[PDB]
Tab-separated table of C-alpha atoms in Angstrom:
chain	number	residue	atom	x	y	z
A	1	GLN	CA	-87.126	-21.022	91.276
A	2	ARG	CA	-84.613	-22.204	93.837
A	3	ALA	CA	-85.638	-24.823	96.374
A	4	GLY	CA	-86.068	-23.480	99.896
A	5	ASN	CA	-84.208	-24.119	103.150
A	6	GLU	CA	-86.663	-23.071	105.936
A	7	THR	CA	-89.311	-25.813	105.733
A	8	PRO	CA	-88.550	-29.380	104.553
A	9	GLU	CA	-90.964	-30.951	102.053
A	10	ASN	CA	-92.650	-34.102	103.303
A	11	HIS	CA	-95.115	-35.663	100.854
A	12	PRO	CA	-98.164	-37.389	102.396
A	13	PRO	CA	-98.054	-41.033	101.342
A	14	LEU	CA	-100.762	-42.723	99.290
A	15	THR	CA	-101.764	-46.157	98.090
A	16	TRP	CA	-103.187	-46.925	94.663
A	17	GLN	CA	-102.829	-49.802	92.254
A	18	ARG	CA	-102.840	-51.312	88.792
A	19	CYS	CA	-105.176	-54.137	87.765
A	20	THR	CA	-104.167	-56.435	84.938
A	21	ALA	CA	-107.499	-58.300	85.016
A	22	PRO	CA	-110.863	-57.995	86.843
A	23	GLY	CA	-109.737	-59.713	90.074
A	24	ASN	CA	-106.077	-58.815	89.827
A	25	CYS	CA	-104.980	-55.585	91.528
A	26	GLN	CA	-101.965	-54.721	93.708
A	27	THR	CA	-100.681	-51.609	95.478
A	28	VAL	CA	-98.357	-48.804	94.441
A	29	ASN	CA	-97.068	-47.115	97.532
A	30	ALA	CA	-97.026	-43.546	96.365
A	31	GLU	CA	-97.321	-40.040	97.801
A	32	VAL	CA	-98.861	-36.747	96.744
A	33	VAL	CA	-97.632	-33.207	96.392
A	34	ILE	CA	-99.255	-29.773	96.433
A	35	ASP	CA	-99.098	-27.454	93.461
A	36	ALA	CA	-96.343	-24.885	93.941
A	37	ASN	CA	-98.773	-21.979	93.803
A	38	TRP	CA	-99.521	-22.518	97.504
A	39	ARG	CA	-95.974	-22.187	98.720
A	40	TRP	CA	-94.006	-19.527	100.484
A	41	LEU	CA	-91.514	-17.767	98.205
A	42	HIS	CA	-88.661	-15.777	99.753
A	43	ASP	CA	-85.134	-14.592	99.250
A	44	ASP	CA	-82.318	-15.194	101.719
A	45	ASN	CA	-83.806	-12.804	104.279
A	46	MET	CA	-87.214	-14.489	104.325
A	47	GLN	CA	-88.578	-11.326	102.762
A	48	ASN	CA	-91.381	-12.461	100.507
A	49	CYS	CA	-91.297	-12.349	96.737
A	50	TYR	CA	-95.080	-12.650	97.022
A	51	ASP	CA	-97.658	-11.825	99.706
A	52	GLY	CA	-101.428	-11.302	99.564
A	53	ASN	CA	-101.956	-11.510	95.816
A	54	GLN	CA	-98.863	-9.576	94.802
A	55	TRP	CA	-95.113	-9.404	94.346
A	56	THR	CA	-92.822	-7.430	96.690
A	57	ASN	CA	-89.529	-5.662	95.922
A	58	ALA	CA	-87.554	-8.784	96.842
A	59	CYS	CA	-88.079	-9.261	93.084
A	60	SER	CA	-88.366	-7.048	89.996
A	61	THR	CA	-88.006	-8.757	86.612
A	62	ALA	CA	-89.032	-12.073	85.063
A	63	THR	CA	-85.648	-13.729	85.196
A	64	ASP	CA	-84.121	-12.387	88.407
A	65	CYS	CA	-87.178	-13.506	90.391
A	66	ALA	CA	-86.345	-17.099	89.481
A	67	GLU	CA	-82.740	-16.411	90.501
A	68	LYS	CA	-83.557	-14.705	93.808
A	69	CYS	CA	-86.582	-16.475	95.267
A	70	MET	CA	-87.210	-20.004	96.492
A	71	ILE	CA	-90.549	-21.695	97.222
A	72	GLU	CA	-90.781	-23.822	100.362
A	73	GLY	CA	-92.145	-26.974	101.974
A	74	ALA	CA	-95.772	-26.660	103.117
A	75	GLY	CA	-95.285	-27.607	106.763
A	76	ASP	CA	-98.065	-29.991	107.817
A	77	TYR	CA	-100.727	-30.720	105.203
A	78	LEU	CA	-103.576	-30.611	107.701
A	79	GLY	CA	-102.333	-27.422	109.302
A	80	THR	CA	-102.393	-24.820	106.578
A	81	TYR	CA	-103.971	-26.904	103.791
A	82	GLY	CA	-106.652	-29.267	105.151
A	83	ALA	CA	-105.309	-32.266	103.248
A	84	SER	CA	-105.712	-35.542	105.128
A	85	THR	CA	-104.213	-38.851	103.997
A	86	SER	CA	-104.817	-42.346	105.357
A	87	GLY	CA	-103.923	-45.425	103.296
A	88	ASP	CA	-105.351	-45.043	99.822
A	89	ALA	CA	-107.742	-42.211	100.747
A	90	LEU	CA	-106.898	-38.555	100.073
A	91	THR	CA	-109.022	-36.053	101.970
A	92	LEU	CA	-109.218	-32.341	101.128
A	93	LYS	CA	-110.770	-29.665	103.409
A	94	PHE	CA	-112.246	-26.752	101.407
A	95	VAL	CA	-111.518	-23.877	103.748
A	96	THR	CA	-108.861	-24.302	106.346
A	97	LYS	CA	-108.602	-22.071	109.400
A	98	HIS	CA	-105.157	-22.170	111.079
A	99	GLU	CA	-103.341	-20.050	113.670
A	100	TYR	CA	-101.937	-17.899	110.867
A	101	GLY	CA	-104.629	-17.887	108.146
A	102	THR	CA	-107.560	-19.114	106.039
A	103	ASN	CA	-106.616	-21.184	102.927
A	104	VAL	CA	-109.257	-22.324	100.437
A	105	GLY	CA	-109.275	-25.156	97.953
A	106	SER	CA	-106.167	-27.064	96.942
A	107	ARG	CA	-104.650	-28.897	93.984
A	108	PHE	CA	-102.872	-32.196	94.653
A	109	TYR	CA	-100.802	-34.186	92.123
A	110	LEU	CA	-100.140	-37.926	92.370
A	111	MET	CA	-96.411	-38.779	92.383
A	112	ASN	CA	-93.957	-41.612	91.801
A	113	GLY	CA	-91.219	-40.889	94.289
A	114	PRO	CA	-90.585	-37.422	95.730
A	115	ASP	CA	-88.940	-36.035	92.582
A	116	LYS	CA	-91.189	-36.886	89.645
A	117	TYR	CA	-94.922	-37.239	89.034
A	118	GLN	CA	-96.469	-40.592	88.297
A	119	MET	CA	-97.391	-40.507	84.616
A	120	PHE	CA	-100.381	-42.387	83.179
A	121	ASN	CA	-100.798	-43.814	79.705
A	122	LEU	CA	-104.434	-43.135	78.860
A	123	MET	CA	-105.336	-44.728	75.534
A	124	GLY	CA	-106.439	-48.348	75.898
A	125	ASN	CA	-106.925	-47.641	79.593
A	126	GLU	CA	-109.464	-46.981	82.297
A	127	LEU	CA	-109.236	-45.193	85.619
A	128	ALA	CA	-111.254	-46.089	88.723
A	129	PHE	CA	-111.579	-44.399	92.054
A	130	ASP	CA	-113.850	-43.947	95.038
A	131	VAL	CA	-115.421	-40.612	95.869
A	132	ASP	CA	-117.383	-39.420	98.851
A	133	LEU	CA	-118.539	-35.923	97.884
A	134	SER	CA	-121.626	-35.780	100.083
A	135	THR	CA	-120.669	-32.412	101.555
A	136	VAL	CA	-119.533	-30.641	98.419
A	137	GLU	CA	-121.950	-27.754	97.943
A	138	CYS	CA	-123.044	-25.607	95.029
A	139	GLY	CA	-120.228	-23.163	94.285
A	140	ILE	CA	-117.537	-25.805	94.993
A	141	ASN	CA	-115.808	-27.962	92.357
A	142	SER	CA	-114.286	-31.187	93.688
A	143	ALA	CA	-112.377	-32.391	90.620
A	144	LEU	CA	-110.159	-35.365	89.744
A	145	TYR	CA	-108.462	-35.405	86.323
A	146	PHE	CA	-105.554	-35.718	83.881
A	147	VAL	CA	-103.192	-32.989	82.591
A	148	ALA	CA	-100.160	-33.503	80.333
A	149	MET	CA	-97.692	-32.073	82.826
A	150	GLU	CA	-93.988	-32.935	82.601
A	151	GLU	CA	-92.646	-35.743	84.782
A	152	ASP	CA	-90.025	-33.720	86.633
A	153	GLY	CA	-92.474	-30.837	86.896
A	154	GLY	CA	-90.315	-29.047	84.290
A	155	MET	CA	-86.795	-29.336	85.754
A	156	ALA	CA	-85.305	-30.544	82.496
A	157	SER	CA	-87.088	-28.342	79.975
A	158	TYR	CA	-86.760	-25.202	82.094
A	159	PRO	CA	-83.673	-25.456	84.323
A	160	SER	CA	-84.424	-22.061	85.962
A	161	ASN	CA	-86.572	-24.206	88.235
A	162	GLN	CA	-84.376	-25.894	90.826
A	163	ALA	CA	-87.586	-26.888	92.601
A	164	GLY	CA	-89.528	-29.161	90.225
A	165	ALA	CA	-92.185	-31.844	90.717
A	166	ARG	CA	-90.671	-32.304	94.180
A	167	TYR	CA	-92.525	-29.118	95.129
A	168	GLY	CA	-95.371	-29.650	92.617
A	169	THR	CA	-94.004	-27.299	89.962
A	170	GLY	CA	-95.046	-27.286	86.331
A	171	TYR	CA	-98.849	-27.287	86.257
A	172	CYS	CA	-100.844	-26.669	83.075
A	173	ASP	CA	-104.306	-27.451	81.649
A	174	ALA	CA	-106.529	-26.411	78.728
A	175	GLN	CA	-107.227	-23.096	80.513
A	176	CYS	CA	-103.544	-22.174	80.151
A	177	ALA	CA	-103.006	-21.481	83.883
A	178	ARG	CA	-102.058	-17.766	83.990
A	179	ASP	CA	-102.613	-17.614	87.739
A	180	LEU	CA	-99.311	-19.349	88.443
A	181	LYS	CA	-96.412	-17.370	89.901
A	182	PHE	CA	-93.857	-19.134	87.747
A	183	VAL	CA	-94.221	-20.524	84.237
A	184	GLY	CA	-91.592	-22.293	82.170
A	185	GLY	CA	-89.392	-22.128	85.271
A	186	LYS	CA	-89.763	-18.361	84.920
A	187	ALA	CA	-91.660	-15.628	86.809
A	188	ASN	CA	-94.983	-13.967	85.909
A	189	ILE	CA	-94.332	-10.806	87.895
A	190	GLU	CA	-94.156	-7.999	85.293
A	191	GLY	CA	-97.902	-7.512	84.792
A	192	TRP	CA	-99.261	-9.470	87.737
A	193	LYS	CA	-102.981	-8.745	87.728
A	194	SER	CA	-104.282	-9.160	91.280
A	195	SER	CA	-107.864	-10.260	91.798
A	196	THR	CA	-110.568	-7.960	93.040
A	197	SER	CA	-112.142	-11.031	94.611
A	198	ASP	CA	-109.637	-13.483	96.087
A	199	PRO	CA	-106.969	-11.853	98.222
A	200	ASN	CA	-104.406	-14.529	97.426
A	201	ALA	CA	-104.190	-14.734	93.661
A	202	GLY	CA	-103.227	-13.098	90.404
A	203	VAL	CA	-102.547	-13.470	86.700
A	204	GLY	CA	-99.306	-12.679	84.862
A	205	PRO	CA	-98.438	-12.490	81.182
A	206	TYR	CA	-97.544	-16.177	81.012
A	207	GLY	CA	-99.888	-19.145	81.038
A	208	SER	CA	-99.264	-22.878	81.276
A	209	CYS	CA	-101.050	-24.922	78.572
A	210	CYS	CA	-101.438	-28.622	77.699
A	211	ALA	CA	-104.156	-31.217	77.129
A	212	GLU	CA	-106.787	-31.470	79.811
A	213	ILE	CA	-109.021	-34.375	80.671
A	214	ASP	CA	-111.550	-33.476	83.282
A	215	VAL	CA	-112.525	-37.017	84.225
A	216	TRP	CA	-114.322	-35.717	87.275
A	217	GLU	CA	-115.423	-32.129	87.772
A	218	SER	CA	-118.162	-31.977	90.445
A	219	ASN	CA	-120.205	-31.418	93.593
A	220	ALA	CA	-123.016	-33.493	95.113
A	221	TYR	CA	-125.486	-31.897	92.670
A	222	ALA	CA	-123.914	-32.381	89.236
A	223	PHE	CA	-120.865	-33.731	87.477
A	224	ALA	CA	-119.265	-33.489	84.077
A	225	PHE	CA	-116.863	-35.514	81.982
A	226	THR	CA	-114.884	-33.062	79.868
A	227	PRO	CA	-112.034	-34.034	77.537
A	228	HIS	CA	-109.951	-31.226	76.037
A	229	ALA	CA	-107.164	-31.258	73.468
A	230	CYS	CA	-104.946	-28.443	72.074
A	231	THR	CA	-103.064	-28.034	68.750
A	232	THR	CA	-99.992	-28.777	70.882
A	233	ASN	CA	-101.044	-31.156	73.637
A	234	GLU	CA	-97.703	-31.172	75.487
A	235	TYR	CA	-97.144	-28.402	78.093
A	236	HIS	CA	-96.267	-25.077	76.502
A	237	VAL	CA	-96.057	-21.381	77.339
A	238	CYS	CA	-98.498	-19.072	75.513
A	239	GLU	CA	-98.171	-15.296	75.121
A	240	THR	CA	-100.809	-13.110	76.783
A	241	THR	CA	-103.229	-12.519	73.897
A	242	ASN	CA	-102.187	-15.961	72.538
A	243	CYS	CA	-103.439	-17.489	75.733
A	244	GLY	CA	-107.133	-18.455	75.676
A	245	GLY	CA	-109.132	-19.686	78.697
A	246	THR	CA	-110.883	-18.230	81.732
A	247	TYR	CA	-108.213	-15.847	83.047
A	248	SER	CA	-107.880	-14.132	79.675
A	249	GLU	CA	-109.501	-11.454	77.507
A	250	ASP	CA	-110.348	-14.011	74.814
A	251	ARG	CA	-111.534	-17.446	75.970
A	252	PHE	CA	-110.999	-18.716	72.441
A	253	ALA	CA	-107.865	-16.937	71.256
A	254	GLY	CA	-105.109	-19.503	71.852
A	255	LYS	CA	-103.946	-23.034	71.077
A	256	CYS	CA	-106.313	-24.913	73.443
A	257	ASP	CA	-110.077	-25.415	73.625
A	258	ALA	CA	-111.002	-24.156	77.119
A	259	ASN	CA	-114.527	-25.614	76.850
A	260	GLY	CA	-113.959	-29.088	75.434
A	261	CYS	CA	-116.794	-31.584	74.822
A	262	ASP	CA	-118.626	-32.206	78.088
A	263	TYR	CA	-120.961	-34.918	79.282
A	264	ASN	CA	-122.896	-33.323	82.106
A	265	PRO	CA	-126.109	-35.262	82.669
A	266	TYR	CA	-128.175	-32.284	83.829
A	267	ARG	CA	-126.949	-30.195	80.927
A	268	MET	CA	-127.792	-33.102	78.642
A	269	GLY	CA	-131.355	-34.027	79.589
A	270	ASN	CA	-131.740	-35.884	82.913
A	271	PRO	CA	-132.138	-33.658	85.989
A	272	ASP	CA	-133.092	-36.435	88.392
A	273	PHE	CA	-130.064	-38.629	87.761
A	274	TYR	CA	-127.255	-37.283	89.945
A	275	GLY	CA	-127.703	-35.325	93.187
A	276	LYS	CA	-128.795	-35.689	96.801
A	277	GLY	CA	-130.517	-39.092	96.785
A	278	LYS	CA	-131.077	-39.681	93.075
A	279	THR	CA	-130.348	-42.512	90.631
A	280	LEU	CA	-126.737	-41.687	91.356
A	281	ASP	CA	-127.320	-40.827	95.030
A	282	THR	CA	-124.459	-38.468	95.908
A	283	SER	CA	-125.123	-38.714	99.655
A	284	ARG	CA	-122.761	-41.615	100.233
A	285	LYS	CA	-119.584	-42.782	98.521
A	286	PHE	CA	-119.680	-44.343	95.040
A	287	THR	CA	-117.292	-45.754	92.423
A	288	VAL	CA	-116.435	-43.957	89.207
A	289	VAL	CA	-114.660	-45.442	86.238
A	290	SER	CA	-113.735	-43.629	83.008
A	291	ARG	CA	-112.480	-45.136	79.764
A	292	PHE	CA	-110.193	-43.623	77.128
A	293	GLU	CA	-110.236	-45.314	73.692
A	294	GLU	CA	-110.009	-44.110	70.094
A	295	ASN	CA	-113.019	-41.883	69.510
A	296	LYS	CA	-114.634	-43.498	72.607
A	297	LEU	CA	-114.342	-42.085	76.119
A	298	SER	CA	-116.805	-43.804	78.466
A	299	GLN	CA	-117.992	-43.320	82.032
A	300	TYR	CA	-120.021	-45.523	84.407
A	301	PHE	CA	-120.586	-45.831	88.162
A	302	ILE	CA	-120.719	-48.365	90.934
A	303	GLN	CA	-122.758	-47.319	93.976
A	304	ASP	CA	-123.394	-49.970	96.571
A	305	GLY	CA	-122.519	-52.967	94.439
A	306	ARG	CA	-124.664	-51.979	91.457
A	307	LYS	CA	-123.536	-50.834	88.015
A	308	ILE	CA	-125.008	-47.490	86.996
A	309	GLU	CA	-124.657	-46.108	83.494
A	310	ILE	CA	-125.258	-42.492	82.490
A	311	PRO	CA	-128.561	-42.010	80.634
A	312	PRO	CA	-128.391	-40.804	77.012
A	313	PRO	CA	-129.282	-37.164	76.220
A	314	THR	CA	-132.829	-36.032	75.526
A	315	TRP	CA	-131.853	-33.277	73.059
A	316	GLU	CA	-133.246	-33.716	69.539
A	317	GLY	CA	-130.269	-34.134	67.229
A	318	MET	CA	-127.910	-35.815	69.674
A	319	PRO	CA	-127.121	-39.521	69.478
A	320	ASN	CA	-128.876	-41.955	71.742
A	321	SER	CA	-125.879	-42.550	73.973
A	322	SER	CA	-123.988	-41.158	76.942
A	323	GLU	CA	-120.543	-41.605	75.421
A	324	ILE	CA	-117.901	-39.210	74.157
A	325	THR	CA	-117.658	-39.852	70.453
A	326	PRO	CA	-117.247	-37.808	67.241
A	327	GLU	CA	-121.025	-38.247	67.012
A	328	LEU	CA	-121.690	-36.673	70.422
A	329	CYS	CA	-119.268	-33.746	70.196
A	330	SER	CA	-120.572	-32.663	66.817
A	331	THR	CA	-124.350	-32.552	67.331
A	332	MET	CA	-124.412	-30.967	70.818
A	333	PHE	CA	-123.422	-27.736	69.056
A	334	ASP	CA	-126.348	-27.511	66.683
A	335	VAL	CA	-128.049	-28.092	70.006
A	336	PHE	CA	-126.317	-25.713	72.439
A	337	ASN	CA	-125.457	-23.690	69.340
A	338	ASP	CA	-122.382	-21.541	69.909
A	339	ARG	CA	-118.593	-21.637	69.416
A	340	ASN	CA	-117.436	-25.106	68.380
A	341	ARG	CA	-113.984	-24.648	69.824
A	342	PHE	CA	-113.520	-28.403	70.234
A	343	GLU	CA	-113.513	-28.816	66.467
A	344	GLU	CA	-111.505	-25.587	66.001
A	345	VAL	CA	-108.363	-27.248	67.246
A	346	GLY	CA	-108.823	-30.431	65.209
A	347	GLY	CA	-111.914	-32.273	66.511
A	348	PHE	CA	-111.847	-35.658	68.329
A	349	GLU	CA	-108.975	-36.892	66.201
A	350	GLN	CA	-106.870	-34.292	68.075
A	351	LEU	CA	-108.410	-35.415	71.299
A	352	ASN	CA	-107.260	-38.917	70.318
A	353	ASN	CA	-103.749	-37.525	70.096
A	354	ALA	CA	-104.055	-36.073	73.633
A	355	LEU	CA	-105.003	-39.549	74.833
A	356	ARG	CA	-101.593	-40.647	73.532
A	357	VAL	CA	-100.000	-38.101	75.854
A	358	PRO	CA	-98.822	-39.397	79.242
A	359	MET	CA	-100.528	-37.122	81.778
A	360	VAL	CA	-100.212	-36.396	85.524
A	361	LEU	CA	-103.016	-37.394	87.908
A	362	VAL	CA	-104.578	-34.564	89.887
A	363	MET	CA	-107.134	-34.148	92.666
A	364	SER	CA	-108.458	-30.757	93.740
A	365	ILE	CA	-111.040	-28.563	95.423
A	366	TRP	CA	-111.813	-24.883	95.041
A	367	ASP	CA	-114.362	-22.153	94.363
A	368	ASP	CA	-114.882	-19.941	91.317
A	369	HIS	CA	-114.292	-16.210	91.493
A	370	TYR	CA	-115.007	-15.974	87.765
A	371	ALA	CA	-118.149	-17.993	87.255
A	372	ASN	CA	-119.087	-19.105	90.774
A	373	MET	CA	-119.312	-22.685	89.501
A	374	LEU	CA	-122.533	-21.824	87.679
A	375	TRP	CA	-121.167	-23.610	84.672
A	376	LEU	CA	-121.057	-26.866	86.654
A	377	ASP	CA	-124.188	-26.950	88.729
A	378	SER	CA	-126.759	-24.406	87.658
A	379	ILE	CA	-127.830	-22.011	84.908
A	380	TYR	CA	-124.950	-20.708	82.747
A	381	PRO	CA	-124.601	-18.475	81.156
A	382	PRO	CA	-127.217	-16.342	82.931
A	383	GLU	CA	-128.006	-14.555	79.689
A	384	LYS	CA	-130.970	-16.548	78.506
A	385	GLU	CA	-131.889	-19.484	80.732
A	386	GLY	CA	-134.522	-21.738	79.150
A	387	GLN	CA	-132.169	-22.745	76.372
A	388	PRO	CA	-130.810	-26.256	75.570
A	389	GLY	CA	-127.938	-26.890	77.958
A	390	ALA	CA	-128.120	-23.548	79.748
A	391	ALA	CA	-129.258	-25.738	82.630
A	392	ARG	CA	-126.273	-27.507	84.140
A	393	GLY	CA	-127.726	-28.284	87.529
A	394	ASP	CA	-130.448	-27.872	90.140
A	395	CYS	CA	-128.481	-25.397	92.240
A	396	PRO	CA	-129.460	-21.709	92.305
A	397	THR	CA	-127.694	-18.977	90.307
A	398	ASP	CA	-127.205	-17.082	93.540
A	399	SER	CA	-124.710	-19.621	94.814
A	400	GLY	CA	-121.052	-19.997	93.873
A	401	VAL	CA	-119.786	-16.779	95.413
A	402	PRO	CA	-116.450	-17.286	97.192
A	403	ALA	CA	-116.827	-15.432	100.515
A	404	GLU	CA	-120.338	-16.807	101.004
A	405	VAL	CA	-119.804	-20.540	100.401
A	406	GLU	CA	-116.483	-20.213	102.205
A	407	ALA	CA	-117.925	-19.387	105.603
A	408	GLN	CA	-121.212	-21.150	104.862
A	409	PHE	CA	-119.578	-24.576	104.670
A	410	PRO	CA	-115.875	-24.396	105.490
A	411	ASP	CA	-115.713	-28.065	106.306
A	412	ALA	CA	-116.620	-28.775	102.700
A	413	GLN	CA	-114.220	-31.487	101.632
A	414	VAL	CA	-113.852	-34.378	99.198
A	415	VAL	CA	-113.105	-38.013	99.937
A	416	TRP	CA	-110.882	-39.387	97.161
A	417	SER	CA	-109.785	-43.027	97.393
A	418	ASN	CA	-109.078	-46.461	95.944
A	419	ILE	CA	-107.555	-45.132	92.731
A	420	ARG	CA	-107.120	-48.030	90.314
A	421	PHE	CA	-106.109	-48.028	86.647
A	422	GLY	CA	-105.269	-50.551	83.922
A	423	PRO	CA	-106.619	-51.923	80.611
A	424	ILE	CA	-110.333	-51.581	80.121
A	425	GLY	CA	-112.238	-54.355	81.951
A	426	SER	CA	-109.396	-54.639	84.417
A	427	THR	CA	-110.231	-52.146	87.230
A	428	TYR	CA	-113.780	-53.209	88.064
A	429	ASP	CA	-115.487	-56.487	87.092
A	430	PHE	CA	-118.008	-54.645	84.917
């Protein structure tokens, strides 16, 4: 896609840091960008190439779209998008009501100058941030995570994109992102499958794939660590029926494991841990750190000065520990018993490869027109209930429906902040 000339692009700045040792940290003045799927696309008459959830006749074919349209700057990030930045802290307003429209959920990427994403080396490293998610309700997923995006957002590998990271191009993830309007610096028109639910989205014949590490998927009633590798962990374009994931006919036909190996406490045995005023009281801010080693991914919290670890699972046949290890990942499948995709694409070993894949940092809020976030915070899938791991959370199986959460708590928002990273032992003194 060409880069627009109607609305400048002004990233909202952002501090974060690296810590070489437990009392040694120091700032990185950065800035964030919004994923390009939120942008206005238009030819040289300002006639859309997209509008509602569908393409216009400013376009036509795959290729020419990328030659005729340009995406634009987003104006003011509070205005249409509800994103608020002050110092280190990124804010994100679920639903935003503005003079010309209602936007819902966003995806922000962390950058490294306005042209290329900051890229993190995971293995032998931990990440730490602050999160205040006290107002995130059932049916809302406030996530933070890693995805092996390309630095320039794809502007070397796919030169049909004269926009790039600068305008948050190039997204991917182990769901193989078929909702994007461009993939591989190319259009997804020809087959754009509009949603019956959300008026502003679709699905083309092209998805964007890559490794996906869901450090933090969540609300104030349940969370989930979820690593995910692929048999190619680096960004890559899959072909319709050779795209797996959520937006597809076959969740499991593809190169990536859309489900990964998850550590959700509630799903694993302790329903009084996380939530409004629990062990991990969600009703203030707390610290999360997450560690990426060989065959060991580990998560712990700090809430009000105190170290909190995640309790081990109570499921007979799972290890006695709250870690992500070859041990975990195996045995939770004789437990939850169903499709071991994780293994299918080469087990943990493969996930260790993904860890040796520089990824982009992402923050994001949204709702779930497919599953209504059941899979995070309640009973999923509906279809038995009363079965090991069907319970993911305390929330009701009513909840999660877009239109209803969307005007039930518009001001839903997440407080991201104090993002630190470095060797293990180096971000927090614990």
